[PDB]
Amino acid sequence: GEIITLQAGQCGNHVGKFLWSQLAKEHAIGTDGLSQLPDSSTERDDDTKPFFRENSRNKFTPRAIMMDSEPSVIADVENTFRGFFDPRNTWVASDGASAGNSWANGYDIGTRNQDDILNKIDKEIDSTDNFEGFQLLHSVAGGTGSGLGSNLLEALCDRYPKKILTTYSVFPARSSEVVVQSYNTILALRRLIEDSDATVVFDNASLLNISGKVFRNPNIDLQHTNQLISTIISSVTNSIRFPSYMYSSMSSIYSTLIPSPELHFLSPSFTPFTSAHKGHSSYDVMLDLLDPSNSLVSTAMNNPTYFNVYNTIIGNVEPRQISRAMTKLQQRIKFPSWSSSAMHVNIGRRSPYLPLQPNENEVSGMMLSNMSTVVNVFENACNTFDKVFAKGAFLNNYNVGDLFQSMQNVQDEFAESREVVQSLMEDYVAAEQDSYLDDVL
Amino acid sequence: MGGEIITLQAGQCGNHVGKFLWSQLAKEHAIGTDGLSQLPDSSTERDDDTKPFFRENSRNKFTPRAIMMDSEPSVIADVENTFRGFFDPRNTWVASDGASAGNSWANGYDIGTRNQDDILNKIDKEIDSTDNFEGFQLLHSVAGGTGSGLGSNLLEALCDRYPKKILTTYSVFPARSSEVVVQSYNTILALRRLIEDSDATVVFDNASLLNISGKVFRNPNIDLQHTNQLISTIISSVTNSIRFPSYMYSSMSSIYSTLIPSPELHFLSPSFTPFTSDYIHDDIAHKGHSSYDVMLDLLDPSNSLVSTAMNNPTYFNVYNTIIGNVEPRQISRAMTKLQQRIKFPSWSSSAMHVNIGRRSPYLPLQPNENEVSGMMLSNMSTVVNVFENACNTFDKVFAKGAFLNNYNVGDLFQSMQNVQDEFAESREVVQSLMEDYVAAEQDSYLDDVLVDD
Amino acid sequence: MREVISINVGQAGCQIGNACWELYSLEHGIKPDGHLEDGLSKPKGGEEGFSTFFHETGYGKFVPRAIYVDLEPNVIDEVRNGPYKDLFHPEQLISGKEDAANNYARGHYTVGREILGDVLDRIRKLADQCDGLQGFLFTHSLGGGTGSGLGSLLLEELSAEYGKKSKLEFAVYPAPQVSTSVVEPYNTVLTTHTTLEHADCTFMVDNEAIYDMCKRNLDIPRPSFANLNNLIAQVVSSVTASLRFDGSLNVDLNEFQTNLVPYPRIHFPLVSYSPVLSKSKAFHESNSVSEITNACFEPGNQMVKCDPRDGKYMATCLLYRGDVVTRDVQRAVEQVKNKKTVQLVDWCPTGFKIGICYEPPTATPNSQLATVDRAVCMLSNTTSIAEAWKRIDRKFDLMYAKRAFVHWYVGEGMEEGEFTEAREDLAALERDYIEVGADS
Ligand SMILES: Nc1nc2c(ncn2[C@@H]2O[C@H](COP(=O)(O)OP(=O)(O)OP(=O)(O)O)[C@@H](O)[C@H]2O)c(=O)[nH]1
Ligand SMILES: Nc1nc2c(ncn2[C@@H]2O[C@H](COP(=O)(O)OP(=O)(O)OP(=O)(O)O)[C@@H](O)[C@H]2O)c(=O)[nH]1
């Protein structure tokens, strides 16, 4: 039942800082880890156990281990959260600052210091008994981050085959470094096809655009996007951090959302929210959740083929608007004839120990969709990689260890990554057809 | 079955650790550095017992039952000046023989043999001042040559002078030696007598000492005095079972009964959590650990005071004493988890043993995060690894015989041939000891009594 | 047994001893006049010194127990002009009425032992005055043949007298290019003979390397003999600081002697000290002791015309003075193990006799080197001295074949067999060092 968070790269460190701050504000833990709730009443309806370890001091240490090749960002996160995280749960490889934005250097750093991370995760798991899986926070664009993520993914698949492993990965925006960044992505994406049990997708361009829309200043800071990701992660975990009757396990959410292990890449959406009036009813909330300008990923599709959709509405809601919006969405969203037109809604309770977010009494909603829009960004990334690879052989200059000893194996690994992502997108586009399940009908 | 124990300070390290241990005991029993109990003598009810280690001449004064033995009078005078009236001046032995003429074990053995009458007279006089006596606790300081020779001399005297007393020993080994040959030779010559006569021996490798002093202390530079403080706190924690007697272990013989499986295997491996009575002990309330975590740390190699060399190590007698407000359910959980996480020899179904101690009513109470501490002692064969490299040194230097012009003086043999033969015999003895330890790591060891009856 | 007796032989030896006593009094805050000044002042008493070298009188005066022996009356007048003669007792200084020869042919002859009898009864009386002795100290030079001869003869006599205490002989070695006296090769060979007679430990030092250091490191245009004597005072003070002051790693002199000699015969270890830099450069640099160790391993800080990088590594001792951190010395030995430049012998390899002195180093104001709070002294055994001895032996054999001065020698009272045996002893020592380097 307990879940461990993995913050890879500076992006991972930032989003972990933001998410742990958000959760400490929600569960009333604060930046000092001490219980902000009085000791007179012990009755609680939340569950800080899977995310926080409570000691004899009644201090909640975040169940997270930070892995990065850059010690400065981790030291800064520690400074802003002095007395919150455990110094023993910090891993910087003891190799100094980061160097090289290729997946080779990151994966080699992971392979070299794999023993320390294994000891750390074993100690963290042995602290309790009821463990369920890990949470990985990394950017596929970051070379060291993607290398560390792939290394830990391999370690956790060949070490814990019974623990479901989900990850959060943000694809970069339309920029210049993608010519190498995409490289790392597809390599990580390769492992994402092999060992990743679940994955939530993000596109940095759409994230920046939506932030500039919701934020007044168009000069969107990366910390603001990190705050957005912390909000979406706290929202998807609301059913876990605040279970009442129905949803008390991420396994159930991945059951109702992931139909098959080959399709475990979900696109999120969250609306409306601040980062002060209510003007979006639950019906409006859901029709906005359907709107492309509220999804955390670039849609770039006229009518995406939804396979399995599931949402959680936060706020006090009446089932009448729920049913009206469900009927309207069934009239709007198309499902394949071979799959089910399943739509599920979870009523997420609000935390009484959380400071009131701006726009009070404004009902909000999060939705996770499995459609052919994730494969559109995947095709964009794979096309960029194919162009920059078949057109220019420059990747044979930035490699480490086994990848630097010979570049032909690097070319073969990149070609195999291209082949496996091609097979994945082909399986996706075939699932869009009714003839996908023709072998039984 | 409880008797009094006398401390034996041999060498400079021996005297320093004795000073630190007696200061720690004065801190625990409120005796201070003046020898007069800081508590008024009107309160007769005392949960502890200073009698096994403190002789009481006046009601408020408790003289530590210990003898100070060294060849360098400077450290003895320093300890006596710092501890004004605490120690007994008549129990300070220097022999007025001057400074040691080198770090040779032969020099210390000779200075102990020549002045054997005086030290034996002092020991007999101290035995006369007591009635119920059980044994001694000898501090070797085998890193020094004169100290190791003196310790070997005292051992060779007390083995046959008092065969009915259990003689425990404490050997401190250095991490790195400037001249590994001389220190290796001294340690081998002392270990010969340890195997022959010593009943119990606790090793202290300075590598883990330096590592821990760098980890838990704030200062990067490591001073020898607060490093000896670690060993002194260790000795106080182990003697707590008699000074603050529990309800399971109340005698050193009973403690060694579960720790000595046979007179051959008499070398133990220590481990201790982050201490609390040391100098820099303020960074202990941020740990937020439980008794199960304390047991894990006791089983962790980072808390072992000797070179671990943990390559599937075989345990023979795992025991622990836990001081503080201990819970039985946490103890049961820790035992369950450790029995699933500790390698045991298949020929013996005996598992690890857990003991619980009591905290002193006058010691500074610590916060609820490190209020409870614990000490662990495990019989492991990896201790011979600490000697292995040492023997390696022997095995790579004994082919030539360097530094032979220094072990020829003092001892009974001035010739090179006799010293060479004695060194070869000591090497054979330590080789046979390592063979016994590696045979105990197998099930055929116990099967030897099954194949023949 | 803690006391140490020092001997000053020859002109250069007397000057070196003067500089050494000057630096000694300067470190303990004592004026060169006496009474006091001042103390016996925290901790100039116990731990000794100043009572090991500075015998304390009944009134508190600290007289340095030194014997200045030289057959040159000029040097005696010079050492009398200084205030240390007033500090010394008139019986401590031994005046030379007439110089034996130029400079060794008669110094080591019967004319030497005529005054050696007097100096030996004086040494016996002094030992009766001050009991206890840790080691015999000697200061002389190979350039002044009288100094070398008298020092070698007195060393042999005292080793035959006691033989239980160590012998530390400081000998100044001439540069292989300049020969102020053409008699010096013969003298050096015959002195190597006397060292083969008795040598507990001998320190080799070349004035050429020291003058080069003063020109380069001390930025001195023309290095003076006074600066060389001051540097020798500094190095010997750093050596004796282990016994003078308190330290976490205090090493006995006999311990040094036995550590330097693991083999059946080792007599000649080379020395090196650091830092030796300019005053302004000392103000410009604030390096740790690790860089000081790295610089001391270089041939520049050796103060001798020998390259330790060329010769093979043997058992060495690293002394440190001032503020020392264990992490610093651990990083230093790590970097040394990472160097892997010199070849290590099979017995020693991980051998570095570490000594620590809490007292900060102190330098004289006349010296261009600013006083430092940290100093590292490396004393190691090397086979480059064998090469220097081989060059000197080539020159001496050429002169012996030319037999020009052998006539004057046999007129002085020398024999062909004596020089033949001295040459054989020198060749034997060279071959011995060659073999113990080859055994690595
Ligand atoms: N939204 C968001 N993305 C970030 C942030 N920081 C890093 N990233 C992602 O990381 C990518 C850049 O790579 P880096 O973060 O430098 O990772 P790296 O290349 O391995 O370099 P190091 O992290 O220093 O090891 C960008 O494309 C971003 O998508 C952040 O603060 N917010
Ligand atoms: N860790 C530690 N080791 C010490 C201490 N004192 C001495 N030693 C050890 O002892 C060795 C030096 O020998 P000494 O203890 O001085 O014995 P000694 O040389 O005969 O000198 P004396 O005992 O005074 O006669 C060193 O290698 C140390 O390992 C100390 O205070 N702390």
Cα separation, C68 vs C137, whole angstroms: 12
Angle between helices A178-194 and A374-391 (to 10 degrees): 120
Angle between helices C416-438 and C404-412 (to 10 degrees): 110
Q: Is C145 annotated as a binding residue?
A: yes
Which ligand neighbours the alpha carbon of A8 most closely? 1
- Position C129: which residue type? Q
CA distance B395 to chain C (A): 11
Instruction: For strands C166-173 and C201-206, give the pairing.
Output: parallel
Contact B221 C325 (CB under 8 A): yes
Contacts of B340 in chain A (CB under 8 A): none
Q: Any residues with CB less than 8 A from the CB of A15 and at least 6 apart, and which?
A: A7, A137, A168, A226, A229, A230, A233
Tell the burial category of A439 from Cβ atoms under 10 Å away from its Cβ (0-12, 13-18, 19+). exposed
**Alpha helices in B167-319, H assignment, sequence order:** 180-196, 206-216, 224-243, 252-257, 291-299
Radius of gyration of chain C (CA): 21
Angle between helices A114-126 and A143-159 (to 10 degrees): 60
Q: CA geometry: angle at A79 spanning A78 and A84, to 5°?
A: 50
Per DSSP (E only), the strands in A2-130 are 2-8, 52-54, 60-62, 64-67, 90-91
Of the candidates A368, A175, A397, the one whose C-alpha atom is nearest the C-alpha of residue A257 is: A368
Cα separation, B331 vs B293, whole angstroms: 10
Name beta bridge partners: C70.
Answer: C95
Name beta bridge partners: A131.
Answer: A2
State whether the beta carbon of A16 lies less than 6 angstroms from ligand 1.
no
Is there a single domain that holds both residue C55 and residue C130?
yes
Domain ranges, ordered by start, for chain A: 1-266, 267-371, 372-435
- Residues in chain B, overall count: 453
Q: Any residues with CB less than 8 A from the CB of B299 and at least 6 apart, and which?
A: B271, B338, B341, B342, B376
Q: CA geometry: angle at C417 spanning C411 and C420, to 5°?
A: 110
State whether the beta carbon of A12 lies less than 6 angstroms from ligand 1.
no
How many CB atoms within 10 Å of residue A218? 10
Q: Any residues with CB less than 8 A from the CB of C163 and at least 6 apart, and which?
A: none
How many CB atoms within 10 Å of residue A409? 12
Q: Is C335 annotated as a binding residue?
A: no
Angle between helices A103-112 and A143-159 (to 10 degrees): 40
Is there a single domain that holds both residue C260 and residue C168?
yes
Tell the burial category of A397 from Cβ atoms under 10 Å away from its Cβ (0-12, 13-18, 19+). exposed
CATH number at residue C400: 1.10.287.600
Which ligand neighbours the alpha carbon of A185 most closely? 1
Is there a single domain that holds both residue C423 and residue C433?
yes
The SS3 of residue C413 is: coil
How many CB atoms within 10 Å of residue A387? 12
Domains in chain C, number: 3
Which letter does DSSP use for residue C299 in this model? G
Contact B352, B335 (CB under 8 A): yes
**Residue A421 corresponds to which tokens in the numbers above?**
């992502």
Of C247, C269, C291, the residue that ends a domain is C269
Is there a single domain that holds both residue C63 and residue C3?
yes
Is there a single domain that holds both residue C19 and residue C102?
yes
Cα separation, B41 vs B411, whole angstroms: 50
Is there a single domain that holds both residue C322 and residue C410?
no
User: Residue C18: phi, psi to the nearest 5?
Assistant: -60, -50
The SS3 of residue C143 is: coil
Of the candidates A36, A69, A10, the one whose C-alpha atom is nearest the C-alpha of residue A223 is: A10
**Residue C354 corresponds to which tokens in the numbers above?**
């570490």
Contacts of C248 in chain B (CB under 8 A): 223-224
**Residue B142 corresponds to which tokens in the numbers above?**
């085998």
Cα separation, A152 vs C179, whole angstroms: 73
Cα separation, A279 vs B37, whole angstroms: 78
Contact A170, A228 (CB under 8 A): no
Nearest protein Cα to ligand 2, atom 19: B144
Q: Is C416 a catalytic residue?
A: no
The SS3 of residue C189 is: helix
How many CB atoms within 10 Å of residue B2? 17
Nearest protein Cα to ligand 2, atom 17: B144
Of the candidates B185, B110, B129, B124, the one whose C-alpha atom is nearest the C-alpha of residue B158 is: B124
Contacts of B368 in chain A (CB under 8 A): 56-57
The torsion of the CA quartet C181, C196, C12, C235, rounded to 10 degrees, works out to 130
Which of C157, C255, C291, C412 is labelled catalytic? C255
- PDB experimental method: cryo-EM
Tell which of A34, A35, A56, A59 to mutate to test the B interface (max B CBs under 10 Å): A56
Of C366, C384, C402, the residue that ends a domain is C384
Angle between helices A143-159 and A178-194 (to 10 degrees): 10
Q: Does A213 contact B at CB distance below 8 Å? A: no
Q: Does B77 contact C at CB distance below 8 Å? A: no
Contacts of C262 in chain B (CB under 8 A): 179, 181, 402-403
Of the candidates B257, B201, B253, B205, the one whose C-alpha atom is nearest the C-alpha of residue B433 is: B201
Cα separation, B380 vs B312, whole angstroms: 10
Instruction: Please give the resolution of this entry in Å, rounded to 1 decimal.
Output: 8.2
Nearest protein Cα to ligand 2, atom 5: B13
Nearest protein Cα to ligand 1, atom 27: A172
**Residue C75 corresponds to which tokens in the numbers above?**
């040097």
Q: Which long-range contacts (CB under 8 A, 24 or more apart) does C220-224 make?
A: C220/C368
CATH number at residue C365: 3.30.1330.20
Residue C327 has its nearest CB partner, among B74, B221, B403, at B221
Tell which of B283, B286, B291, B327 to mutate to test the A interface (max A CBs under 10 Å): B286
Is there a single domain that holds both residue C317 and residue C280?
yes
Q: Is C141 annotated as a binding residue?
A: yes
Owning domain of residue C58: 1-269
Instruction: For strands B373-380 and B315-323, give the pairing.
Output: antiparallel
Of B9, B12, B153, B228, best ligand 2 pocket probe by most atoms within 8 Å of the beta carbon:
B12
Is there a single domain that holds both residue C83 and residue C179?
yes
Q: Is C229 annotated as a binding residue?
A: yes
Please indicate whether chains A and C are in contact, defined as at least 3 beta carbon pairs under 8 Å.
no
Q: Does A40 contact B at CB distance below 8 Å? A: no
Q: Report the pocket of ligand 2 as residue ranges, CB < 6 Å.
A: B 11-13, 16, 70-72, 75, 100, 103, 141, 143-147, 174, 206, 224-225, 227-228
Q: Is C11 annotated as a binding residue?
A: yes
Nearest protein Cα to ligand 1, atom 18: A142
Contacts of A56 in chain B (CB under 8 A): 288, 290, 368-369
Distances (CA, A) of B427 to B143, B201, B204, B414: 18, 19, 21, 20
Q: CA geometry: angle at A177 spanning A173 and A181, to 5°?
A: 80
Contact C346 B396 (CB under 8 A): yes
**Residue C239 corresponds to which tokens in the numbers above?**
């050596």
Q: Any residues with CB less than 8 A from the CB of C374 and at least 6 apart, and which?
A: C275, C288, C289, C292, C320, C321, C322, C323, C324, C360, C361
Which ligand neighbours the alpha carbon of A148 most closely? 1
